[PDB]
Design a protein around this ligand. Sequence first.
Ligand SMILES: CCC1=C(C)/C(=C/C2=NC(=C\c3[nH]c(/C=C4\NC(=O)[C@H](C)[C@H]4CC)c(C)c3CCC(=O)O)/C(CCC(=O)O)=C2C)NC1=O
Ligand SMILES: CCC1=C(C)/C(=C/C2=NC(=C\c3[nH]c(/C=C4\NC(=O)[C@H](C)[C@H]4CC)c(C)c3CCC(=O)O)/C(CCC(=O)O)=C2C)NC1=O
Ligand SMILES: CCC1=C(C)/C(=C/C2=NC(=C\c3[nH]c(/C=C4\NC(=O)[C@H](C)[C@H]4CC)c(C)c3CCC(=O)O)/C(CCC(=O)O)=C2C)NC1=O
Ligand SMILES: CCC1=C(C)/C(=C/C2=NC(=C\c3[nH]c(/C=C4\NC(=O)[C@H](C)[C@H]4CC)c(C)c3CCC(=O)O)/C(CCC(=O)O)=C2C)NC1=O
Ligand SMILES: CCC1=C(C)/C(=C/C2=NC(=C\c3[nH]c(/C=C4\NC(=O)[C@H](C)[C@H]4CC)c(C)c3CCC(=O)O)/C(CCC(=O)O)=C2C)NC1=O
Ligand SMILES: CCC1=C(C)/C(=C/C2=NC(=C\c3[nH]c(/C=C4\NC(=O)[C@H](C)[C@H]4CC)c(C)c3CCC(=O)O)/C(CCC(=O)O)=C2C)NC1=O
Ligand SMILES: CCC1=C(C)/C(=C/C2=NC(=C\c3[nH]c(/C=C4\NC(=O)[C@H](C)[C@H]4CC)c(C)c3CCC(=O)O)/C(CCC(=O)O)=C2C)NC1=O
Ligand SMILES: CCC1=C(C)/C(=C/C2=NC(=C\c3[nH]c(/C=C4\NC(=O)[C@H](C)[C@H]4CC)c(C)c3CCC(=O)O)/C(CCC(=O)O)=C2C)NC1=O
Ligand SMILES: CCC1=C(C)/C(=C/C2=NC(=C\c3[nH]c(/C=C4\NC(=O)[C@H](C)[C@H]4CC)c(C)c3CCC(=O)O)/C(CCC(=O)O)=C2C)NC1=O
Ligand SMILES: CCC1=C(C)/C(=C/C2=NC(=C\c3[nH]c(/C=C4\NC(=O)[C@H](C)[C@H]4CC)c(C)c3CCC(=O)O)/C(CCC(=O)O)=C2C)NC1=O
Ligand SMILES: CCC1=C(C)/C(=C/C2=NC(=C\c3[nH]c(/C=C4\NC(=O)[C@H](C)[C@H]4CC)c(C)c3CCC(=O)O)/C(CCC(=O)O)=C2C)NC1=O
Ligand SMILES: CCC1=C(C)/C(=C/C2=NC(=C\c3[nH]c(/C=C4\NC(=O)[C@H](C)[C@H]4CC)c(C)c3CCC(=O)O)/C(CCC(=O)O)=C2C)NC1=O
Lengths: 172, 172, 172, 172, 172, 162, 162, 282
Amino acid sequence: MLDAFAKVVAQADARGEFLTNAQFDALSNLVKEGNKRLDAVNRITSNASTIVANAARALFAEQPQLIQPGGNAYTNRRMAACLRDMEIILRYVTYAILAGDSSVLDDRCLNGLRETYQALGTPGSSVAVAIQKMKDAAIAIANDPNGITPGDCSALMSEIAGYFDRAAAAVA
Amino acid sequence: MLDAFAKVVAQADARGEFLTNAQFDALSNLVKEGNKRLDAVNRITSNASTIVANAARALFAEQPQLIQPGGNAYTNRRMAACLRDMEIILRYVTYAILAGDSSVLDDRCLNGLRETYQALGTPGSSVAVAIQKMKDAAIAIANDPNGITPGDCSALMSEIAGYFDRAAAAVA
Amino acid sequence: MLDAFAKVVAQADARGEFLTNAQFDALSNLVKEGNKRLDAVNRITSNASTIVANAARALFAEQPQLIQPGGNAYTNRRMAACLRDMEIILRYVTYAILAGDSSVLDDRCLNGLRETYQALGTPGSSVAVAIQKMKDAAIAIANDPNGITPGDCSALMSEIAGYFDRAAAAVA
Amino acid sequence: MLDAFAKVVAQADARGEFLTNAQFDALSNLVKEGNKRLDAVNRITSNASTIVANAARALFAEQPQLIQPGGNAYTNRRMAACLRDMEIILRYVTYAILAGDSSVLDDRCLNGLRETYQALGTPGSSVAVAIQKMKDAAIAIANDPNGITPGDCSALMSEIAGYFDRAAAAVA
Amino acid sequence: MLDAFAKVVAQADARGEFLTNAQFDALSNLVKEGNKRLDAVNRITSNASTIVANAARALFAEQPQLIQPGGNAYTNRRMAACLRDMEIILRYVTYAILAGDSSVLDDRCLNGLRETYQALGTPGSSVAVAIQKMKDAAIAIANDPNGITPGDCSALMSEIAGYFDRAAAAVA
Amino acid sequence: MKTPITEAIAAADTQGRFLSNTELQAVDGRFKRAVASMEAARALTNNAQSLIDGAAQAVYQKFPYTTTMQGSQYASTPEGKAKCARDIGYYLRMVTYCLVAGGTGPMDEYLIAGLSEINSTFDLSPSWYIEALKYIKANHGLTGQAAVEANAYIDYAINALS
Amino acid sequence: MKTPITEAIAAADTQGRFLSNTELQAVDGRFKRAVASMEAARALTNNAQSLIDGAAQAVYQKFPYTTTMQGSQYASTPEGKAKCARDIGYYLRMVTYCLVAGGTGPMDEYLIAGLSEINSTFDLSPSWYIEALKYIKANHGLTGQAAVEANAYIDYAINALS
Amino acid sequence: AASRLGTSAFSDAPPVELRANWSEEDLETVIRAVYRQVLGNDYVMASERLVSAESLLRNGKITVREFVRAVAKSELYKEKFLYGNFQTRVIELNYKHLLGRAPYDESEVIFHLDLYENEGFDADIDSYIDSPEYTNSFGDWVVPYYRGFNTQPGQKTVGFNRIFRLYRGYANSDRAQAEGSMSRLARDLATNRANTVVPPSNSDTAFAYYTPSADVPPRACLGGSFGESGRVYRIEVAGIRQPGYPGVRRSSTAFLVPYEQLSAKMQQLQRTGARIISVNPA
Ligand SMILES: CCC1=C(C)/C(=C/C2=NC(=C\c3[nH]c(/C=C4\NC(=O)[C@H](C)[C@H]4CC)c(C)c3CCC(=O)O)/C(CCC(=O)O)=C2C)NC1=O
Ligand SMILES: CCC1=C(C)/C(=C/C2=NC(=C\c3[nH]c(/C=C4\NC(=O)[C@H](C)[C@H]4CC)c(C)c3CCC(=O)O)/C(CCC(=O)O)=C2C)NC1=O
Ligand SMILES: CCC1=C(C)/C(=C/C2=NC(=C\c3[nH]c(/C=C4\NC(=O)[C@H](C)[C@H]4CC)c(C)c3CCC(=O)O)/C(CCC(=O)O)=C2C)NC1=O
Ligand SMILES: CCC1=C(C)/C(=C/C2=NC(=C\c3[nH]c(/C=C4\NC(=O)[C@H](C)[C@H]4CC)c(C)c3CCC(=O)O)/C(CCC(=O)O)=C2C)NC1=O
Ligand SMILES: CCC1=C(C)/C(=C/C2=NC(=C\c3[nH]c(/C=C4\NC(=O)[C@H](C)[C@H]4CC)c(C)c3CCC(=O)O)/C(CCC(=O)O)=C2C)NC1=O
Ligand SMILES: CCC1=C(C)/C(=C/C2=NC(=C\c3[nH]c(/C=C4\NC(=O)[C@H](C)[C@H]4CC)c(C)c3CCC(=O)O)/C(CCC(=O)O)=C2C)NC1=O
Ligand SMILES: CCC1=C(C)/C(=C/C2=NC(=C\c3[nH]c(/C=C4\NC(=O)[C@H](C)[C@H]4CC)c(C)c3CCC(=O)O)/C(CCC(=O)O)=C2C)NC1=O
Ligand SMILES: CCC1=C(C)/C(=C/C2=NC(=C\c3[nH]c(/C=C4\NC(=O)[C@H](C)[C@H]4CC)c(C)c3CCC(=O)O)/C(CCC(=O)O)=C2C)NC1=O
Ligand SMILES: CCC1=C(C)/C(=C/C2=NC(=C\c3[nH]c(/C=C4\NC(=O)[C@H](C)[C@H]4CC)c(C)c3CCC(=O)O)/C(CCC(=O)O)=C2C)NC1=O
Ligand SMILES: CCC1=C(C)/C(=C/C2=NC(=C\c3[nH]c(/C=C4\NC(=O)[C@H](C)[C@H]4CC)c(C)c3CCC(=O)O)/C(CCC(=O)O)=C2C)NC1=O
Ligand SMILES: CCC1=C(C)/C(=C/C2=NC(=C\c3[nH]c(/C=C4\NC(=O)[C@H](C)[C@H]4CC)c(C)c3CCC(=O)O)/C(CCC(=O)O)=C2C)NC1=O
Ligand SMILES: CCC1=C(C)/C(=C/C2=NC(=C\c3[nH]c(/C=C4\NC(=O)[C@H](C)[C@H]4CC)c(C)c3CCC(=O)O)/C(CCC(=O)O)=C2C)NC1=O
């Protein structure tokens, strides 16, 4: 498990040299915009249930073959599994947002996902559509300018979008 | 595992249509001859020990390499193991006969059995020959026309032979 | 590839004893009904194309999910493959009928077909249903009581049905 | 294929450095006893056919079940193959003797032989017995004190035994 | 795993003949040379710590890249593991020396080791060099004539070198 | 094997075509002649022991040196006489197998293949077996088309030894 | 050509072995059937003129448009109907050839192999040659085994055209 | 790394083209090498050799390409492989014997199988023989050799893996192999699944590791596994025999083990006697 700070330390340890002034400056920038990071994590986790539920309804409205008999999200057991996996991806993305890097996301929920879904028969393209639906919803709720102090958050928004996209690209 | 009833129900659920009249008639035919299935399983299971013993003596007489020193069925420990596995195959086949479907046989006994023997170094061809010896012995004992109410049980006997053949082809 | 006569000879060679009178009588019985076997294969081969075509249209009428988009027998290339794999089975079953032994059918067609199909993901149960459709078609065509000297051929018809059933059970 | 000189060179190449005085002395010992090596290989090659033939007669006298009907040295085709394999083992051992290293013996001949015999069903232990018969015959032929300038040769004879032993143990 | 006596017994049991007089005299030679074997193993085990420590110092002096930052012995955890593995090799080799056979050395050591270092990333070639350093140390400590009843021990020393070499080459 | 039925099946299989009328006609001929073929096989096996013993004596008379000259290939020892009887028995058993199979398949699979190799290594001159097969051909006492089929297979073996 | 005799010869040639009893049995069967086949062929060729003309009229009646539609492929002009008759005659000549050859060889070499391509390029609708061959199948005038074997060849041609 | 992998020495190419195309001795060598490669190192008896082809071969009327085709279509080849195996397995064997490689993707089976289904087997062999690959790597005067080991031509990486499934040793013949009589590279070919390299036996214990993914852990860990520091190493084993309670079950199998426990697990596995096939990070 490597967060941003751990990543910098690990690279510096590979070289065997003390952190350069540039690396120090980068991590100082990270901490000076830390409140934004934790605020985004808080907003995503506060609406997690609604995010996953709305995105699921949208996915099954866009691709009815999934919920038709025979489709891979049918018989109510596989439906539960599908909702579970959507929320699992959301949970690991939230971890990644707090950490600041995608290491956790790529290690613990993206590493073998493609092969497992391929073997299961789960359509990976559909899963990518679902995670992009979640991406838009979470981005909007975190970026809502009403309800909190104004400021700039665009870099963090781009980062969260990047992590959702990483998941979508790996599963499909 | 799926027995015959469960298999038809599972296929109907996968397609998503109430069981049709044709399927109902098929299942009624199966239950109409159910007593025959039960009698066959009873007759084979009560002679299990003799079936395996006679087949084993025949196998070692026809392929002496197994009981020669340095062969696979030697040292009296591997002989015990060989008899144990022959009766294991017989047991899972009897389960299959009672069920009416090969799902149990294909999920526990012959499931990944080829790999097992290939790694152990046993000749799989010889295992198939042993299963065939058991097939003829068991089908003779089960189809014995003396001792019970007369009738034509040939269809069920062919099904029993089919199970034995499936195992023999999956091990070699 | 061994026919019935060759099968008996090979088994006798394994024992190493001249063919006994009983074995001679058995082979003579096989030759005595050989004309019937020849007529059966002739009739089935003459209608092979119609047999597979009618059985295919029936299969896709009873299981529409195959030809619905996203199913296994869709895109017109896989449809061609499906027809090809039905006619292949019919051809090797005809070979088995002429031989009088199922060795060819079990060695060059049924030996590993199940594994290939499940790796492909194509439903093996549906393949078995198709085999049964071809079974009824061919058994009706061959036993048609018109055009040739009448007789009792029920035994040969049962044997033909046995070959078809063996294929259907081995694939699913 | 590595010979003795090549073996020393390859180890020295793995470690870099430069050929040590000890290694030089070892190779000098090899060359000062080279005439012995060449004489031994010449004697074994000159009597190859009779060595194989005599050992074969002994093997089939000691283990008659091999040539009895249904055994693996039956039917005159497998007998030809068995004679071939005995001669091939002798040939690659002769190669090894001339080389001075057993790399050739394990790189081509023994490379895969074990699984080949395991799949064929041929009893490996019996093959080992046959190799040992050849071992005694060939070592006696080479160690015959009459016919050549006398001198110490026991080390080379033990080396020949070592090669035969390696083959016999790897087959069994 | 086996020992020397057990190895001879097992091979002769596989072939199915009472132990021959040749085998008897070989084993008697082994036991007449037994006290030497026990002395050697006692001396190597008593100096195990010094052997591994000196060999480690030499290895890191000859291959400085190992202990430099970013190398496979760096970080003080991998260094501990490396010393542990060198001692492990020594331990299994001492087992082998007492046994008189390399059966234990191949059954509970070296089997999988080769691939273990390739997976971890640890260079296996360096491991081989380290095993050779340990070989020199242990051979010298065992062959020291001072402090023990004088006699011939060259054969035993060559056997110990053979074990060490087997491990060092097959791990790389 | 190279059995008429099997050969027809293989001919159709290599071309991936359903069994054509030509092959069916061939197999029909096989069935029509099978009655005589099986009669001949029965006749040979009913007199098998007498044939084997007679052939053994025949080769002993044609090649007297084989009963006197010392060597493993010769039958001077009683063990060698047993071996000679066993091998002539092999040949007769194979001829009966070929008679019932209606083709040369059994002969080629359990004999002929590598016959030269074995006869060279163990120093077993083919002439011995050739004379024995001649005796079998003359004493089997068959008549008609059964006789012609049996003689054909025996001569196949004779020419293969040569 | 794919004569049974020739096919057996080729099968033995590819293996390089002398003709065994299997091939001899096959050719004997062909000789035994040849009597009926040759009588049928003689009958069909002695009565050829009637059949060819009748088939021409049959297709002119079943497809009237073909003798009243302008185009080179059509027989409205006298030259066109002459060519139609000539082609029907070719089919009848081929059926006699395949009757005497004891197989479908002649038909496959001088027809069948190529009929699809030519029927597409020269606008020769297969239906024409289906109906004509059916007329020949009905008016052949044979009886017994001759009738069945000749009709077998004619239906081979029908099933190849379509 | 040569001996363990099995490629003892496959390090040259035997042509026959010469002014002395017979070369009085070299032609004997070329004929032997063709028999070894085309018939899969089968022990051909002297009587059943294809004498007719060799006649034209020395005469110069036929080239090495024609000789290879003659053997490939002769019934000598058909009895060993073509008639007796699943058709897809036959396609694999053709690729091994004629083009010296293994199927790189499923499309290969599609094409060759369709040829067999319509045109016949003779046409299938024809396609292998005159494919651009055979025309280039070999040259109508060069005996086919296993070029799959070398990567120069341009091929999917999986090819290397797959060829080691077909070649199970210098001694081995495809008529006689551990997994013979059934498809060796069929289930994998449809899924484009890689295969762990099974080294052929060499003067040590052998345990052919079948790898049906029907019941094995996935190649990746697909989770955090135990969660201990470090990634998850997948350890395979084949010969588990000592602890047979119902009979051990699934004697050949793999276990995904977290890094810290590897050592312990290793010794356990060694105790049963199975020789670890591979230890791959997941
Ligand atoms: C319970 C744990 C905990 C939380 C949640 C927390 C929040 C927190 N966020 C802050 C700042 C802030 N939060 C934002 C956030 C945003 N700007 C935007 O444009 C977006 C719409 C949004 C991203 C979601 C900004 C710009 C600041 C001020 C600058 C900064 O310190 O990062 C501040 C300092 C100024 C203030 O009082 O607002 C606090 C205390 N502190 C805590 O100890
Ligand atoms: C504990 C569970 C249970 C068993 C075992 C059982 C046996 C049982 N089998 C029966 C019939 C029968 N048993 C057979 C059996 C055979 N016919 C043959 O030719 C074969 C040799 C053989 C089958 C392989 C037949 C044909 C009938 C009559 C029809 C039927 O009920 O299936 C009957 C009814 C007639 C009678 O015997 O009174 C009973 C009660 N009933 C049970 O409740
Ligand atoms: C080239 C291969 C070949 C063919 C085509 C052939 C035809 C053929 N079919 C025959 C009869 C027959 N066909 C049958 C067959 C049947 N009985 C039934 O109830 C069913 C409806 C049907 C099963 C298909 C029977 C029983 C005979 C008469 C007895 C016999 O010869 O088998 C006969 C003998 C009597 C006769 O001349 O009519 C011949 C020659 N013979 C051949 O050698
Ligand atoms: C074609 C290439 C070639 C070969 C093969 C060759 C062999 C060769 N080895 C020799 C030596 C030898 N030959 C032996 C032979 C033996 N003494 C014994 O007591 C044993 C029974 C036996 C071991 C098999 C020994 C010990 C030597 C070494 C002494 C010397 O070099 O003269 C000699 C000289 C004396 C002799 O003939 O023995 C020759 C010519 N020289 C060559 O140029
Ligand atoms: C009883 C038989 C047995 C052996 C042989 C064995 C070896 C072994 N050594 C290991 C680790 C290791 N082994 C080394 C060894 C070395 N580093 C170097 O620089 C040198 C070149 C080399 C020593 C000569 C290192 C550095 C690790 C740690 C690797 C890591 O944590 O990533 C591991 C990985 C799991 C672990 O940390 O234990 C194994 C399995 N384990 C066993 O159970
Ligand atoms: C409790 C277990 C146990 C041990 C350890 C033991 C040692 C032991 N070592 C002995 C001899 C010996 N020890 C050595 C040892 C060596 N010679 C060398 O040149 C080398 C440097 C070194 C071996 C590598 C030799 C050569 C002998 C005499 C010959 C022999 O052992 O057979 C002897 C016989 C004479 C004597 O007392 O020295 C004993 C009893 N006895 C025991 O009961
Ligand atoms: C079923 C096919 C088959 C055949 C044909 C066959 C032949 C065969 N005959 C053999 C030997 C033999 N064959 C003979 C035969 C004869 N000795 C004489 O004096 C006579 C002139 C002659 C009778 C014609 C003898 C004596 C042996 C023993 C070889 C020996 O002791 O060296 C051997 C050598 C190994 C052995 O003893 O089995 C073979 C392989 N093996 C087979 O599996
Ligand atoms: C021996 C095998 C064989 C066949 C089958 C064959 C077919 C054949 N038919 C042709 C033409 C023709 N075929 C017809 C036939 C017909 N007109 C009609 O109205 C009918 C419906 C129909 C007869 C059923 C006509 C009119 C032509 C001439 C078309 C042209 O010259 O363009 C031609 C072009 C050369 C020509 O003008 O004759 C060929 C090659 N040739 C052969 O050598
Ligand atoms: C279509 C079947 C076929 C034929 C006919 C054929 C002929 C043929 N015979 C040859 C050799 C030969 N043929 C003979 C034949 C004879 N020597 C004499 O003294 C006699 C007068 C005569 C026999 C009656 C000789 C001596 C050679 C060897 C030429 C040589 O290598 O120097 C060669 C040379 C290459 C080789 O031996 O493979 C060919 C091509 N090859 C074939 O595949
Ligand atoms: C022993 C001779 C032999 C057999 C039997 C065989 C089976 C076989 N069938 C295939 C395809 C196929 N087979 C089917 C079969 C069916 N789909 C359905 O919906 C039905 C239930 C069923 C027919 C009734 C389908 C759909 C495919 C295409 C699969 C795909 O492209 O993904 C493939 C895939 C490769 C290709 O399409 O070329 C193989 C290997 N291969 C062989 O060499
Ligand atoms: C150059 C290195 C090399 C070796 C060693 C090798 C072995 C080898 N031996 C074989 C056969 C065989 N090996 C034997 C061996 C024996 N049977 C017995 O009873 C004896 C105990 C034993 C002889 C001592 C037999 C009988 C066969 C033939 C099996 C068959 O083809 O059916 C086969 C395959 C089947 C065939 O012959 O086509 C191979 C590949 N291949 C090689 O490339
Ligand atoms: C419930 C399903 C199930 C099956 C199928 C099964 C098979 C199975 N049989 C085994 C052993 C064995 N199985 C055999 C079987 C044979 N030996 C021969 O000589 C013959 C050729 C053949 C019987 C005809 C032998 C010899 C062993 C012992 C192998 C050894 O110790 O090396 C083993 C090895 C571990 C052990 O002995 O426990 C397994 C896993 N185990 C199972 O739990």
